[PDB]
Amino acid sequence: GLFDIIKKVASVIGGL
Amino acid sequence: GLFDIIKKVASVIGGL
Amino acid sequence: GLFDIIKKVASVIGGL
Amino acid sequence: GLFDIIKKVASVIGGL
Amino acid sequence: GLFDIIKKVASVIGGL
Amino acid sequence: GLFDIIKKVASVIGGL
């Protein structure tokens, strides 16, 4: 779209 | 898009 | 895009 | 605890 | 605790 | 604690 917002997370514990 | 915001996080404890 | 705001983090504790 | 991790966010769009 | 990690973010678009 | 880590951010676009 006009702006694209992407977040990716990896964790052993507590990826929120 | 016109702006792209990208965040990648790796963690053992806590990826917020 | 016109501007890309890319961030990467690696940590044992507390990626924010 | 031994370490306290705290995150607070305010947004109009796209708070993650 | 022994260490405190505190983050506050204000945004219109995107708070990661 | 023994050490305190604090970060405050204000933005229109993209608080990371």
From Swiss-Prot, chains A, B, C, D, E, F:
Name of a matching Pfam family: Antimicrobial20
GO BP of this protein: defense response to bacterium
Summary of the tissues where the protein is detected: Expressed by the dorsal and submental skin glands.
Top-level taxon of the source organism: Eukaryota
Gene Ontology CC: extracellular region
Keyword Electron transport included in the entry's annotation: no
Major location (coarse): secreted
Localization: Secreted
Residue(s) carrying Leucine amide: 16
Protein task: Bacteriostatic action for Gram-positive bacteria.
Designated name of the protein: Citropin-1.3
Organism: Ranoidea citropa (Australian Blue Mountains tree frog)
